[PDB]
Design a protein around this ligand. Structure first.
Ligand SMILES: c1ccc(-c2ccccc2)cc1
Ligand SMILES: c1ccc(-c2ccccc2)cc1
Ligand SMILES: c1ccc(-c2ccccc2)cc1
Ligand code: FES
Ligand code: FES
Ligand code: FES
Ligand SMILES: [Fe+2]
Ligand SMILES: [Fe+2]
Ligand SMILES: [Fe+2]
Lengths: 177, 425, 425, 177, 425, 178
C-alpha cells in the first residue's frame, strides 16, 4: 500500500467486502466459534501500542516486532481466548457486550503467493454494554487473506490493527477487532 | 474534613471500611497533597531511558512529569509545566532530545529542566534570575532498575520508604547479577474506578484470584492451597504468594515461564542470591503493592503505576520486565504471555476492569455509601516473628495487608508533614 | 444548607419557586438522603415477575436494587451491592435466577438476597455471621399490582403513604376484579433535566397539554371542563378532563376511547368506582405519586423517574392493561402507547426536548437569580368537594404542583419520619 | 442470514446500496415526504427493546411480537408521524436536528416471493441538535425490500432496527433509522 | 473565599499569578456574579441585525440572551428564559420574527421580550400583572458599530467603561465616516481552557506572536512597538510600529496595502489626527475587559464565553469598512478565515496551547506555585503625549497585570459603588 | 444535481471513484499530505459553510452563503499555505500529529456536464484522537466535483463542499482536512 493499489476486478472487491461484512456479523452477533474458524493455523493477530511523537520521530509511533502490544497472538493463544469468551464465568463478556463493526474503505492488492491478498480497511467499532457504557473506537485493519475451500471462501492469515488511540479509552479490550 | 473524621473511616481493629473513601472529592484533593505529593511513586525502569537525552512522560498524581536521562547518567524528574504561563513543556510521550522549548512563548530548557533562555531577556526581563524559574524538581532514586520519584525533601530515602518490602520485591528484581530490563512498550488505559481498589488488590487480594474473578482466565490457559501474605511493619506495602504448587502459574504464564521460574540454572541462581530454595523456586503467582500506587506480580513479571484521575477514575500504565541475561526465547515468551494475561485485553485483567467499574458506579448511590465494607478476613491470625519472612505474616487468603494499606492511608491523610508521619512508627 | 434556607426556596402562599432547587448539588445530595432514602418508590408490577426466581433490576435514587419473587410468593427488594468490596451482585436486567454469585470474590446469595456462602469461611472468616452481611433490604408492599419499596422502617405503610390518592389511582388500577397486568417490556432512556420537572408535569400540568407542547402530537392522531386533585398531604396530584372524548380520541384512537367510555368493561368500572363520571367520563388523566411514580390513567403509561444528579434523569416506562381485556385491546394499548408516550412517541418526543432546554439555561447565574411563577389558580381551591376528595381546583391550575414542592420542602427539612409526620394538619 | 449468503451479482449489490444511500440522503436532508413514500402499505417498522442478559438467557435479549418496543408501526401509524414531523409546531424537529446515516456492510439474500429481498446492513447514526447536543447510535437494519416501478426502484416492506443500546442514550427518538 | 484571600491570588507589584484563578469552581461562580453580572459584554454588530424583527442569540456568561431589533430601531437584549418554568423562549440561532412563543405552555412575547398574553389567563391567572413577569432585560449601548450589554443599572455607561480604550478601538472602528459592517456569519467553537488565558492573550501578549507560537502560520504567508494598559478597567492593546513585514505574512499584500497606502489609509490618518495611527500600526491586538477581544488590521473580533473554569466557547466574526470596495470585503473575508478561525493557520495553534495549559492544572503541584508575570515591570510611562494611559514596550505584561488587577477589584467589590472607589483620583 | 435520484451508473465507475476516496482517506490518515495536496485541482474550491440552527420556515438560511464567513473557503493558493504549515516541525497543532480516521460511505455519482467531470455525494465519520485522551468525532456530507486525471490517483478534486453535522464546532480547532 505504499503506492495506490492497481485496479482490481469489481467481482473481487465485492467478494472480499462480503467476507468482511460476514465477519462483522459473526463478531457482532456473538457467533464466536464461527469467527475463530475463519482464522488460519498461522494467524498472527497483532495490535501494536501507539504513542504520540513529534514529527521528526513518527518512525517510533508504533511498537515494533519484539515489543509490548495490546494484542500479538498466534493460533494457540487465540484458541485460549475462544475458550474464555464462550464461558459462563467470563465476566467481561457475560453479560455480553453489544458491538458494531462498521467496515469501509476496502482496498485490495495481490499477494506474493497466489490465493493471498493484502487488504486495508477502516472501521468504527461501537461497544455498548451494561446500562450505559459506550466506547467508540476507530482504525485501520491491514490484513492478509488467503483463499480456502470453505463457505467463507477465505481464512485470515495476518491482521494488524492500527488503532486511532494512544491511551486506550476503554476499561478493557474484551472483544475482537 | 477533619483528622478525626478521617480516622473513623477506617477500622483495622474490627475490620471496616467506609465506602466514601472511594468517592469523596474533598478526600481526593487531600490525597493528592498528603499522599501523592509526598510518597515515592514509580516513574518506570532505568533501561527505558538508557541514553543521554532519553525521556518519557509520567504522572505523580495528576501532575505530569518529565523523566529524562542526563549527560552524567543522572535521571531527573520535573513537572511538565513552564512557569511562565503554564504550557506543557513537551507533548510527546518519549524520544531523545538535546533540549526542550515551550511552544507558547519560547522559554528554553536543558534536558534537566533548568531554564537556560528567555526570548528578549535583556529588555523584557532585566532582573530575571532564570535559575529560580525552572519547573519543580522531584527527588529521584532507583531500586534494582525501578525509578521512583517524590516531591518532598523531608520524606525518607527510597531504601527506608521501602524498608523490609525490599525482601519481597527481590523475588523479581534481584534474581541475577545482571539485573532486570524492561521490554519496550507501555500500555496505558482508562478504568473508571478509585485507585485504592487496584492498589489494594495487588497488596492483599489473592482471595479474588483463588475464587471467581478469574475462573475464565485459568480456563483459557488450560488444554491451590498453601501460601503466606506479608503486611509491612509500617508504610502500607503488602505482598502475597502461593508456595509449592506450580499448577496455577502454569495456566497463567504457560510451561516455558513456569520451568524458567522453578527449575534449571536460572532458578537455582535465584535461590542462591536469596538464600532460600523456597524463595527462588517454590513461589507461585506473587502479587505486590509498594504503597500507594506501585503494583507488580513477581513471576508473571508485569509491573504498573496506577494514576488517579479524581475518585471515580484511574489510568493503568503497565509494562513487562525480564531478567536481562535470560535467553531471547524467554524474553519473547514473557512478552506474549504477559500481554495475553495482564493487560487491557488480557484474559485475566479484562475481568478486573469490568468488576472495578461496576463497584464505582454502584457507589453513586446513597445507601451504597452509608454502610461499611467488610475488611475482617484474617483478623488476629498473624505472626510478626516468622524466622524466614520479615514483617507481619498471615495466610495467603487474608485482608491483613489491605488493612495495613488503609491504615497507612489514614496516617498520611492525617499527618501535616513527614515529622508527624514518622511519629506513628 | 440550613433548614430555614431550604424553606424559603419555595413559597406556596405567593407561588414562587427558586430555580436552584433544580441545580444545586448539595440539595441533590440531601434529596437522596431525605426523599429517596425514605419515600415509597415504584419498582414495577407484580405480573412482571410472576414465578419464583424471576427478577428485574430497578433503582431507588442512584442506589441499584434487585426485585425478586421468592419461593413463597413474597417479593424482596435489596441493594445490588456485595458488602465485601461493593461489587454489583447481578449485571443482567432481569430473568429467572437460581441464585446469585458475586463475580469478584465469590460471595454467594440466595434469591432473597441472603448471604449463604463465603469461599474459605472456616479458615479466613471464623467469626463471620453471614445473616448480618447481606445487602440492605427494603420494605416491599403492593397496591393493586404496583410494587413499591422503601428503605425506612419509620415510614408509614404504602396504603397510608398513598392515602386519599388511592381514589385517583383506582381510575386505572381498580376498573375490574381481574386487576391489571403489565405488557412485558420496559423502555429506558436518558433526559438531561431535573426530576422535579417530570414529576411536577405529571402531578399538575394539564396546562402544558392544553396549549402548545403537544399540538403536533394531536395532529398525528387525525377540551373545556375538568378538575385537579391536590393531596391534603404528601405531594401527590392528579388532573383530568370531564365529558369530552375529543382529546383521548386524538391520543389513543377510537378503539381505546370506546373501551374507556362505552360497553361492558366501561360500565363495570363505573360500578366498582360507584360513579358514571369516574368510570366513563374521565379523559386524559395525569398523576404523580410523590416523588417519582407517574402515570396517565386511560393511556395507561406508567413510569418511574430515576435521578442522575440534579441535571439528569432516567425514565423507566411501561404499559398496564386490564388483565381481562380482549387480546385485541391489549394489542391496541401496546401500539398506541408506544406511538405516543415513549422516547420516539409523538407526544413525549417533545417533553424530552423542552425539559432539556430548561436545564441547560439554568447554568446561567441570572437564570437562577429570580423565581419561577408558580401562581396559577392561587386561592381558587375547594377542600370540601362532595364527589372528589382532597384539595380540588380547575384542571388548569398549579395547586398540585405547589403541594408537590411544599412536600419537597417538608421532606428536605425533616431529619426523620417523626419530624415529617409532625408537618401534617 | 443463518448461513453466509450465496454471492449475488455485483449489479444487484450496487442497485440496493444506491437505494440505501439515497434513503440516507432523504432522511439527512429532511426530505420526509419522499422518504415515507418508500414505505409499502404493508410496512412493519419495528425497533425492539434490548436488554442485558447473562449468556444462558440471551434468547430474551430482544422484546418479541406482543411486547413493548421503541417502534412497532404500520402504514397508518407512520403516516401520523409524517403529519407530525411536517408541521411548524413539532418542537423536537423544529428546529430540526442534523442527522447522518452512515450505512455499510450491505449483504443481500433473495426473498421468498420474487422481487423481494432480505437485506442486512449496519449503520452509525450521528445526530446533533441545538448548540451542542450529540447522540451517536449504531446497529443493524434487517429489511425486506420489494421491487417497484418508481424511480426509487424499491419499497421498504419490513424493517427491524437492532440498536446497540440497552438504556437509550438520548432524550428522545424523534428521527428515523 | 474571603475578599482578602482573593487579593493575595494576584500581585501587581511583584508580578505573580496564582494558577488556581483558572480552576477553582467557587471563584468561577463569583466571576459570574461579580464580573459577568455587571460588566459590559459584546453582543455583536448593529449590521448583523439591521431590520425590525431581526434577532440573534448570544451569551452573557452562561446566561443565554436574545438580541433583537425593535420597530423603533432600538436593540434590546433579554434572557432567553421563560419565567413560568424556565423554557428557552427561542431555540433558533437567529432569524426574523414578529413575536416569540414559548413552546412549553404558550406564554407569548412581543419582539421586545414583554409578556403580552398567557393562555386561559382569565380563568387561571386573574391577579397576573404581565408587565412584571417578562424575562430580565439588559442595558444595551453601542460603540461605532459594536453592541454591548450589561445587566447592572449602577454600572457606568459604555462610554465611561471603555474610557481611554476608545482611542485604541478607533484604529478599527473609525477609519471612515461610513463606519464598519459585519460580514455575515459567526464561527462558534469549544476550547477546553479558562477564559482568562484568552482574554489575557489579546490584551497583553504580542510576545507569543514574536516568539514560537505562530512560526508555522507566518510560513503559510510567504522589533519596535508599544503596549497600552488602561488607567482603570483592565482593557489592553499592543501593536508594532512601521514594519509591514509581519502584517503581509498574516493578511497578504492587498489587505496590507489597503491598511497602509492609498486614499482609504489617508482618510484613516486624517480621522485619527495622526499618520502613525492610520498607516503605521501593524498587527494590533486588544481586549475590552473582560471577554471582548479583537485585532485591528486583521479585523477579526470575538467574545469568549465561559463554560465553567475549564472551558470556553469562542464566537468570532470579521468586520470591514462599509465603504471598502467589494474586492476588499472579499479579501478580508478569506484571509481572516484562513488565519484567525478554528481551522485557520494561526488560531489552530492557540487552541492546542490553551488546552494543554488547562489539562496540566488538574495537578496539585501544578497549582501550588505562582506563574511569572514580571515582564516589563516598572518599565512604564503614563504621561505619553501621543498615546493615552499606561504605555509600555510592545513586549510586556503590564496590560496582563492590569487585567488581573481589574479581576481582583471586581471579585472583591460587593457592588459598583465599592468598585468606583478603587479608581485613581 | 442530487435533486432527484441519481441515474444508475456502471459498477466499474462506482468502484473506481470509491477507490479514489479510500486512497484519499489513507493519504490524510497516514499523514501523506504532500500526495493529498497533489490530488487538488488548480481551480480547487474547498468550502465548509458555517451551519446554523433554524426553525422549519427558515431552513434556507441554515448554511452560510457565497459572500459570508465560513469554516473553510479556500483556493489553490490558500491550500498551498496550509500544506507549508502542516509540514513544519513548528506547526504545533500537528506536531505532535493528530490521529485521524476518515470512514467514507454512501458514494452516489452523477455525470458532470463537462466530460471527465463528476458530481459525487458521500458521507463520512472523521474520528480524530490526539495527545493523551482528546477525542472529537465529526460527521457530515461531502459534495465533490471530481475530474478524471492521468496521475496514479486517477482524479483530482476540483470542488469540495463539506456539510458538517454541527452548529457550534465541538472541537478546540480544525487543524486537519475533511
Ligand atoms: C492481585 C493481582 C493479581 C492476582 C492474581 C490473579 C490471578 C492469578 C494469580 C494472581 C492476585 C492479586
Ligand atoms: C402530564 C403528562 C402528560 C399530559 C398529557 C399530555 C397530552 C395529552 C393529555 C395529557 C398531561 C400531564
Ligand atoms: C494576541 C493574539 C494574537 C496576536 C497575533 C498573533 C499572530 C500575528 C499577529 C498578532 C497578538 C496578540
Ligand atoms: S508558557 Fe509562556 S513561555 Fe512557556
Ligand atoms: S466484592 Fe463481592 S465477594 Fe468481594
Ligand atoms: S415555561 Fe414558558 S410557558 Fe411555561
Ligand atoms: Fe485480578
Ligand atoms: Fe407532555
Ligand atoms: Fe495567537
Amino acid at each position: 500500500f505504499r503506492t495506490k493499489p492497481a485496479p482490481v476486478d469489481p467481482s473481487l472487491q465485492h467478494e472480499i467486502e462480503q467476507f468482511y461484512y460476514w465477519e462483522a456479523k459473526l463478531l457482532n452477533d456473538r457467533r464466536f466459534q464461527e469467527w475463530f474458524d475463519l482464522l488460519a493455523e498461522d494467524i498472527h493477530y497483532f495490535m501494536p501500542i501507539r504513542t504520540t511523537r513529534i514529527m521528526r520521530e513518527t518512525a517510533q509511533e508504533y511498537s515494533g516486532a519484539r515489543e509490548y502490544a495490546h494484542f500479538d497472538d498466534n493460533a494457540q493463544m487465540m484458541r485460549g481466548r475462544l475458550r474464555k469468551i464462550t464461558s459462563d464465568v467470563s465476566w467481561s463478556e457475560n453479560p455480553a457486550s453489544r458491538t458494531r463493526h462498521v467496515i469501509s474503505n476496502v482496498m485490495i492488492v495481490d499477494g506474493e503467493k497466489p490465493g493471498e491478498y493484502h487488504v486495508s480497511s477502516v472501521f468504527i467499532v461501537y461497544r455498548n454494554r451494561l446500562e450505559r457504557q459506550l466506547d467508540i473506537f476507530a482504525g485501520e485493519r491491514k490484513d492478509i487473506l488467503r483463499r480456502t475451500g470453505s463457505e467463507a471462501g477465505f481464512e485470515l492469515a495476518k491482521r494488524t490493527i492500527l488503532i486511532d488511540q494512544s491511551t486506550i479509552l476503554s476499561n478493557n479490550l474484551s472483544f475482537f477487532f | 474534613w477533619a483528622d478525626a473524621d478521617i480516622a473513623e473511616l477506617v477500622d483495622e481493629r474490627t475490620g471496616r471500611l467506609d465506602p466514601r473513601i472511594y468517592t469523596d472529592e474533598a478526600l481526593y484533593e487531600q490525597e493528592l497533597e498528603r499522599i501523592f505529593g509526598r510518597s515515592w511513586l514509580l516513574m518506570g525502569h532505568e533501561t527505558q531511558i538508557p541514553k543521554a537525552g532519553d525521556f518519557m512522560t509520567n504522572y505523580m498524581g495528576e501532575d505530569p512529569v518529565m523523566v529524562v536521562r542526563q549527560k552524567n547518567g543522572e535521571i531527573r524528574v520535573f513537572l511538565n509545566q513552564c512557569r511562565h504561563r503554564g504550557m506543557r513543556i513537551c507533548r510527546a510521550d518519549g524520544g531523545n532530545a538535546k533540549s526542550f522549548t515551550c511552544s507558547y512563548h519560547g522559554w528554553a530548557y536543558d534536558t534537566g529542566g533548568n531554564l537556560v533562555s528567555v526570548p528578549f531577556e535583556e529588555q523584557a526581563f532585566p532582573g530575571l534570575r532564570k535559575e529560580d524559574w525552572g519547573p519543580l524538581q522531584a527527588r529521584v532514586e532507583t531500586y534494582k532498575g525501578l525509578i521512583f520519584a517524590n516531591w518532598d525533601a523531608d520524606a525518607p530515602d527510597l531504601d527506608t520508604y521501602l524498608g523490609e518490602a525490599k525482601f519481597y520485591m527481590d523475588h523479581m528484581l534481584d534474581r541475577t547479577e545482571a539485573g532486570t530490563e524492561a521490554i519496550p512498550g507501555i500500555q496505558k488505559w482508562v478504568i473508571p474506578c478509585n485507585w485504592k481498589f487496584a492498589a489494594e488488590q495487588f497488596c492483599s487480594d489473592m482471595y479474588h484470584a483463588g475464587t471467581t474473578s478469574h475462573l475464565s482466565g485459568i480456563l483459557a490457559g488450560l488444554p491451590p492451597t498453601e501460601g503466606i501474605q506479608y503486611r509491612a511493619t509500617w508504610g502500607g506495602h503488602g505482598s502475597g504468594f502461593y508456595i509449592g504448587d506450580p499448577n496455577l502459574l502454569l495456566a497463567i504464564m504457560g510451561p516455558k515461564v513456569t520451568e524458567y521460574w522453578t527449575q534449571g540454572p536460572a532458578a537455582e541462581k535465584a535461590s542462591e542470591r536469596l538464600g532460600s530454595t523456597e524463595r527462588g523456586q517454590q513461589l507461585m503467582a506473587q502479587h505486590m503493592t509498594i504503597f500507594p500506587t506501585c503494583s507488580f506480580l513477581p513471576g508473571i513479571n508485569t509491573i504498573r503505576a496506577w494514576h488517579p484521575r479524581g475518585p471515580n477514575e484511574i489510568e493503568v500504565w503497565a509494562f513487562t520486565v525480564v531478567d536481562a541475561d535470560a535467553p531471547e526465547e524467554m524474553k519473547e515468551e514473557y512478552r506474549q504471555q504477559t500481554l495475553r494475561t495482564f493487560s487491557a485485553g488480557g484474559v485475566f485483567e479484562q475481568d478486573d476492569g469490568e468488576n472495578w467499574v461496576e463497584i464505582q458506579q454502584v457507589l453513586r448511590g446513597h445507601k451504597a455509601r452509608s454502610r461499611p465494607f467488610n475488611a475482617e478476613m484474617g483478623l488476629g491470625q498473624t505472626d510478626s516473628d516468622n524466622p524466614d519472612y520479615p514483617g507481619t505474616i498471615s495466610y495467603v487468603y487474608s485482608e491483613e495487608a489491605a488493612r495495613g494499606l488503609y491504615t497507612q492511608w489514614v496516617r498520611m491523610m492525617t499527618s501535616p508533614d513527614w515529622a508527624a508521619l514518622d511519629a506513628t512508627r
